[PDB]
Amino acid sequence: ARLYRLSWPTVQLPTSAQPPSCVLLGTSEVSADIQVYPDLRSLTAALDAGAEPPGVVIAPTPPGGGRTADVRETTRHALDLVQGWLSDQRLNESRLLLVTQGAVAVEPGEPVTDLAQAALWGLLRSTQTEHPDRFVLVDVPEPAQLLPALPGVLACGEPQLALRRGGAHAPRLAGLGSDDVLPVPDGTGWRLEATRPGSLDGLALVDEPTATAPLGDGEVRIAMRAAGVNFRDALIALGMYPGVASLGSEGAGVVVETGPGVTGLAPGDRVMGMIPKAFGPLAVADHRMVTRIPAGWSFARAASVPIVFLTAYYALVDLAGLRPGESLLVHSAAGGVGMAAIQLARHLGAEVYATASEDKWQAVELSREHLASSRTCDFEQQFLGATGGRGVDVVLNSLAGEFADASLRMLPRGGRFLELGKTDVRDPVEVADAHPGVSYQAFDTVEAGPQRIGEMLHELVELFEGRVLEPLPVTAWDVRQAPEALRHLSQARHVGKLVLTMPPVWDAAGTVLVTGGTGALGAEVARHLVIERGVRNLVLVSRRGPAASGAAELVAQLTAYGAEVSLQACDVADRETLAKVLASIPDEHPLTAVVHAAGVLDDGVSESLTVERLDQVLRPKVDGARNLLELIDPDVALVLFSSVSGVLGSGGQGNYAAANSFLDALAQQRQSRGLPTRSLAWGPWAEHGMASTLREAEQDRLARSGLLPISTEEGLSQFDAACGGAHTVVAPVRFSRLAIKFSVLQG
Ligand SMILES: NC(=O)C1=CN([C@@H]2O[C@H](COP(=O)(O)OP(=O)(O)OC[C@H]3O[C@@H](n4cnc5c(N)ncnc54)[C@H](OP(=O)(O)O)[C@@H]3O)[C@@H](O)[C@H]2O)C=CC1
Ligand SMILES: NC(=O)C1=CN([C@@H]2O[C@H](COP(=O)(O)OP(=O)(O)OC[C@H]3O[C@@H](n4cnc5c(N)ncnc54)[C@H](OP(=O)(O)O)[C@@H]3O)[C@@H](O)[C@H]2O)C=CC1
């Protein structure tokens, strides 16, 4: 039994194949000319009144969402469509092409945006297996990509694709690896450093002495959970960073050891700052250079923050002394530092002009007017054009080389100029050479010093909680996959901040909650957690709770292995009851993990499915997972159990597979946003259940009493007879052969 991962290789679409009849199922006009019917019904009408079955109907899906209701509407809608379609049967040899936007993660940079659409994928996948060569799934992030590609989409016979500008992608299961990604020393307190600089291959995770022991000064030791990656980190990795640097500066985590020389904050504390050599389970730094963590921030959203905002602050306050009314020019706007400055600048009451690449513009919250491409030098006369020089009072430049020159001709009036880039660094007096009026400082944030950083840290937080700065968009990765992340980073595909997360680790002190801890899997996992693993505080949770056979025994067993076990009756889909449960977890064993193993089953081809059945199967998986993530503390690890059925589209379980595909998508999106989430797509288990096991046993016991099972027809004729019949107590049974075992059975 392998573990599998679903990949999306590029495929080649046949470029010379015949373009086919097409109708559009949609609200509105088509820029192109192709038949449009607002709904399936109307396309029937045309068929009714003579029209010839189109080879392909396109059904672009209305935008979903990641909320229960969303999932509900957009699978229900998919069902009406699938059912309407199957029942016509003039629409045979014709194919329904359902289009989605962002239901599917294909490229490294990109997360699932529409969970509900991802549910759609599962359901339809099921139906595809039920009816081959009749439906086609297409994820296309911006439509009209579609039509050009359309004769190819159809000729390749492939039922599932995602269109990206890169290419067309098909999905397939793959073994883990394939190289096996990044391997860990397991001996805790390693780190990521570039071993063979020059190339991203030859990154590795090798044990680090420095982190482990001992403190300190001065110093405080941290159990890291996430860390920010900076552009710096990507150059270091490529033997292309002009200066001294150790991979990974900044992060957030939990305090382990403190002292000597430290009083302000103490162990257990959640903390973020500018840690050196950040990319490991264990690192240690100066307690003034780090600070405790605001709102209910995730460790991930904490880790993105420090470097970018310290720079922005240290740069715009200390070095620039930016005043209200004064205006600013910032490069790499949709980047972290670029992103940060514009936020802080708007607080400091400046006008702002800035630059990123055209594809990132939407992510800037700046009036069209003030924007410009960042890999050209056009901005100059457009901005100087935009405002008569004097142009900008201050410049926070990252673009070095010759892009840095067109910069300084902004702000001719005079003013201050800040350089970030070490390659082609300059001289202040020799800068005064080129332009009059302009002072010039080339800085590193660490320059401010521990004293100043801690003071800027305390001052930034204030702003964050004042709701005046908001942490950047996070796109997260697991340290073991850093190469994929740094490649992204160095290719400048991203917006906002990238972040690395450390391998998840449950507080051995803490509580673990298993939903559906009665079920075939939940019990086993429940047992394995207590009997083999650390776990010594359990909450189990199922609709019936302790009242279902044999849950009393199930508990006994564990509590007997010396554990603090609670089994509460609770429907996970009732947020009000879940809350009641979580709250009753004791303060000293606070929960660190959820195993969402709760589930309800259905069976039937998509023809036969109904809305009411759909919701049956959705309620524990979707509402439950939503309730959980809503209620759960951010950095509680969440393990969702889906089913391989959601991935193969097992058929017979359309609607179940929808639920499971949601879970798969919820994790993929959620880990991306930084939070500790993992989703396992179980194939079949041998196990059975307390259930079940107990029903089976009853059957043995009754047999072992030389009894035999009654057919249902006979059982009901007896029901009939015994109900209205003279004897008040009556044993309708079928015996076997002609029992010295039972005294009652004599004569
Ligand atoms: N000295 C110090 O203390 C610090 C220095 N820095 C420096 O500031 C810069 C910004 O850092 P950070 O915000 O973390 O990283 P960013 O997220 O800002 O990434 C850099 C961005 O610059 C843009 N860019 C412009 N020209 C190019 C190019 N030719 N190739 C690739 N990208 C380009 C890219 O986006 P776009 O498509 O919009 O151009 C890219 O996203 C880094 O280079 C870093 O070295 C950062 C922090 C501290
Ligand atoms: N076992 C297998 O062969 C496979 C399992 N899986 C995955 O494993 C999971 C478990 O399968 P299995 O253990 O056999 O399922 P079971 O039906 O045997 O157990 C399901 C458990 O979930 C509980 N439950 C159902 N709905 C709720 C609810 N709304 N609130 C609280 N508890 C609820 C049920 O308790 P009660 O009804 O008493 O409330 C029961 O305890 C499945 O959901 C699926 O994700 C995937 C493929 C195959």
From TrEMBL:
It comes from the Bacteria. NADPH 1 binds at F231, S332, G336, V337, S357, K360, S374, R375, L420, F443, T445, H494. NADPH 2 binds at A520, L521, S542, R543, R544, D571, V572, G599, K621, S642, Y656, W685. This is Polyketide synthase extender module 2. The chain holds residues 1216 to 1966 of 2152 of the full protein.
